Design a protein around this ligand. Structure first.
Ligand code: CNC
Ligand SMILES: CCCCCCCCOCCOCCOCCOCCO
Ligand SMILES: CCCCCCCCOCCOCCOCCOCCO
Ligand SMILES: CCCCCCCCOCCOCCOCCOCCO
Ligand SMILES: CCCCCCCCOCCOCCOCCOCCO
Ligand SMILES: CCCCCCCCOCCOCCOCCOCCO
Ligand SMILES: CCCCCCCCOCCOCCOCCOCCO
Ligand SMILES: *SCC1=CC(C)(C)N(O)C1(C)C
Ligand SMILES: [Ca+2]
Ligand SMILES: [Ca+2]
Ligand SMILES: [Ca+2]
Length: 583
């Protein structure tokens, strides 16, 4: 199966030495995932925490690295984060738009620049699947979904794609114990999300193609906050975002090329709805992001070489700060010689605040017996300082990037019908941007050491398909040697799939290991141990006719009460019932 996230161009997965996962739309439909979080949580090396349930902030820790230490791409282009903190909030990205996820673990700054430390998550929005679908669902806590979608030819050489989605839930009380001020707020904390999307693809020739693509979503999230009597309670968020992409591609026999241009704008309010949103006490974060990427790649020898140039501008609304520019130039290559595979990338970034930083990576693999291979890898990567850190209340505008070195060694194989891989990796992160008590100022100074193991396998027993991973992550502050907070030390993930009669069943197990968080209810904030838990889901689909599929899910089958952030209640048992008429 193909990926194009490792070097921006289509290559076979067996050719990508770094561990790699691909989720298709078929997978997402079977899982009946109603968020990206639920898709992602299921994959190797991914640890998701949430401050609530649907629509509330979630963070991703890939292989023990900080939330901001993952690169999240939407069709190849950095996800627009308005915030001034460094981390994506995937709660907000509508699942309705996800047609494929390519997820590559290990460093990749040497291709994409900043953030690609633990790995890269590329969420792709383009499906090739003609016809038109209507779909819907209902479920627990007044969850309700509606969706219409069409892909149709507009004559020779042109495709229009349109989609509209409404999702809605009333949720449950997230509680937010310790974060709630003088009182608690017992309300249900719900989520409303509406998406619209349209694209056009065109073939000028068999080799040349162009595209124009735009989409937007308008999201409201209730949450719970610090209450102080007679004082505004900011406990509602309205996030608006839009993205527009145009591009041109050449797909020659040997030569491949792409020029992609992009514009994102997000507006992100937070407010007390009693006299609010447009009122002093309401907060507003806003960013516009422009991107221009040109890449080339040519087949040579037994493998390939490519190069690109990458440009990005981020402007934010109201010194000092407000406008940032980055330019990167990189090289990639790949070669197969006998039973050996060699792979590499190197990049030089030039950023308007820190200037120049270079990164590089290299992998070798050896197929020492047919179907069995050893792989060694090394790579450096980096994260740019955020606007809060640079220009905030505690700002230091002369910050340098956070730096990572990673090493990784893997055995993969095919044995008795079972495809399996096991990897050990070490990731030394340094120059971490820390607040410094004695100087009231951020500074590059912290260190972290992550030591991890990833084990995967998939096989079939009869009509049953098994897909299983185990993650070990020892993430620590390397100076003090204490565990980093909010990261599960071990996870076990298991999906069991089968078809009997025309019923398509899916069972999902996950163990979430021991994790540590701060209790915010009493100052000085104590670190506490969260115990760890098993969770099950059960999913059914049935093709009622050739046009109509109907589906049911029970998420968290045993009604298991747990938290991934101390004090924030998770879902409990939920039912979902949905349908799709295709035609
Ligand atoms: C400390 C903190 C927290 N924050 Co702030 C607060 N007040 N926050 C901050 C600070 C983070 C910077 C820092 N690291 O010191 C600070 C002051 C910048 C901040 C800012 C904001 N925060 C905000 C809010 C509303 C919230 N924050 C919490 C996440 C609320 C947290 C409540 C809680 N979780 O207990 C919180 C108390 C602790 C997070 C933590 O300890 N992480 C530990 C770390 C190891 O885990 P982590 O997953 O990597 O956490 C990261 C994120 O929390 C990110 N971040 C923090 N807040 C947000 C909010 C958003 C929307 C996003 C995308 C990211 C963040 O920074 C953290 C570390 O880098 C929140 C859940 C508190 C609550 N229960 O009301 C709430 C989000 C509610 C929701 N589900 O939408 C702001 C919107 C405040 C405002 N109205 O302007 C604002 C938005 C930031 C953005 N980037 O968009
Ligand atoms: C053939 C020139 C293009 C190489 C691009 C990647 C450079 C990254 O540095 C790799 C250093 O690795 C040691 C040399 O042997 C393995 C590298 O693999 C080269 C990719 O074909
Ligand atoms: C395209 C290939 C890129 C390969 C880069 C690998 C080598 C990079 O050099 C080492 C990294 O650090 C740079 C400085 O090295 C010497 C430092 O010693 C003196 C410091 O006081
Ligand atoms: C065709 C594009 C070439 C891009 C190659 C980028 C090389 C990336 O750097 C690798 C090593 O980075 C660390 C050392 O760099 C510091 C700069 O040194 C120059 C001053 O002595
Ligand atoms: C890193 C894990 C160590 C891998 C050890 C495997 C080394 C030998 O590989 C397997 C050799 O194949 C034997 C399996 O049986 C052959 C089946 O042939 C049936 C058709 O006649
Ligand atoms: C080459 C296969 C890699 C998988 C090794 C798993 C078995 C581990 O046994 C050795 C003991 O490991 C010590 C601590 O484990 C975490 C270390 O991870 C590697 C980073 O240095
Ligand atoms: C897995 C270790 C032994 C050799 C590889 C077997 C292939 C792995 O596939 C199964 C992976 O799923 C479960 C593995 O659990 C054991 C991993 O423990 C190693 C911890 O250091
Ligand atoms: S996989 C790389 C990729 C994603 C998407 C944005 C759909 N693209 O146009 C490319 C092929 C660059
Ligand atoms: Ca309603
Ligand atoms: Ca509430
Ligand atoms: Ca609330």
């Amino acid at each position: 199966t193909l990926v194009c996230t490792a070097n921006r161009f289509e290559q076979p997965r067996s050719t990508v030495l770094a561990p790699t996962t691909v989720v298709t739309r078929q997978d997402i439909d079977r899982w009946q995932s109603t968020s990206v979080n639920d898709v992602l949580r299921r994959l190797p090396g991914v640890d998701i925490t949430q401050n609530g349930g649907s629509g509330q902030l979630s963070s991703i820790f890939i292989r023990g690295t900080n939330a901001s230490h993952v690169l999240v791409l939407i069709d190849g282009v950095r996800l627009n984060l308005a915030g001034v903190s460094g981390s994506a909030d995937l709660s907000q990205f509508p699942i309705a738009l996800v047609q494929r996820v390519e997820y590559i673990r290990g460093p990749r700054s040497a291709v994409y620049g900043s953030d690609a430390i633990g790995g890269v998550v590329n969420i792709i929005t383009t499906r090739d699947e003609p016809g038109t679908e209507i779909s819907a669902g209902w479920g627990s806590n007044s969850y309700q979904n509606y969706d219409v979608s069409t892909q149709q030819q507009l004559g020779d050489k042109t495709r229009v794609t349109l989609l509209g989605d409404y999702a809605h839930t009333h949720g449950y009380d997230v509680v937010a114990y310790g974060n709630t001020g003088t009182q608690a707020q017992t309300d249900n904390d719900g989520f409303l999300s509406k998406t619209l999307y349209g694209a056009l693809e065109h073939n000028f020739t068999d080799a040349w193609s162009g595209f124009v693509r735009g989409y937007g979503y308008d999201n409201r999230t209730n949450y719970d906050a610090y209450y102080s009597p007679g004082s505004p309670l900011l406990d509602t968020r309205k996030l608006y975002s839009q993205s527009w992409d145009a591009g041109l591609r050449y797909n020659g026999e040997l030569i491949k090329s792409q020029l992609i241009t992009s514009y994102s704008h997000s507006k992100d309010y937070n407010y007390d709805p009693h006299y609010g949103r447009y009122d002093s006490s309401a907060t507003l974060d806003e960013m516009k992001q422009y991107t221009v990427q040109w890449a080339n790649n040519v087949i040579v020898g037994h493998g390939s070489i490519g190069a690109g140039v990458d440009w990005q501008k981020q402007t934010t609304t109201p010194e000092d700060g407000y406008d940032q520019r980055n330019t990167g130039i990189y090289l990639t290559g790949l070669q197969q010689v006998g039973d050996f595979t060699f792979e590499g990338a190197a990049r030089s970034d030039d950023n308007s605040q820190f200037g120049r930083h270079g990164t590089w990576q290299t992998s070798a693999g050896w197929e020492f017996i047919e179907g069995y291979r050893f792989i060694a890898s090394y790579g450096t990567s980096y994260k740019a300082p955020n606007l809060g850190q640079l220009y905030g209340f505690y700002g230091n505008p002369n910050l340098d990037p956070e730096k990572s070195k990673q090493w990784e060694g893997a055995f993969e194989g095919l044995t008795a019908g079972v495809n399996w891989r096991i990897s050990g990796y070490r990731n030394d992160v340094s120059d971490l941007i820390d607040y410094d008590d004695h100087t009231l100022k951020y500074y590059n100074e912290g260190k972290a050491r992550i030591k991890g193991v990833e084990a995967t396998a998939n096989f079939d027993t009869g009509p049953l398909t098994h897909t299983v991973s185990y993650d070990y992550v020892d993430a620590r502050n390397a100076i003090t040697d204490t565990p980093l907070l909010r990261r599960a030390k071990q996870q076990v993930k298991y999906q069991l799939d089968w078809q009997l009669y025309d019923f398509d069943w899916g069972i999902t197990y996950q163990y979430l290991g021991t994790r540590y968080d701060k209790d915010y209810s009493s100052y000085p904030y104590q670190t506490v141990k969260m115990g760890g838990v098993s969770l099950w889901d059960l999913a059914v689909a049935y093709p009622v006719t050739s046009h109509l599929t109907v589906r049911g899910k029970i998420a968290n089958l045993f009604d298991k009460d747990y938290e991934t952030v101390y004090g924030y209640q998770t879902a409990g048992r939920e039912y979902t019932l949905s349908g799709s008429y295709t035609f």
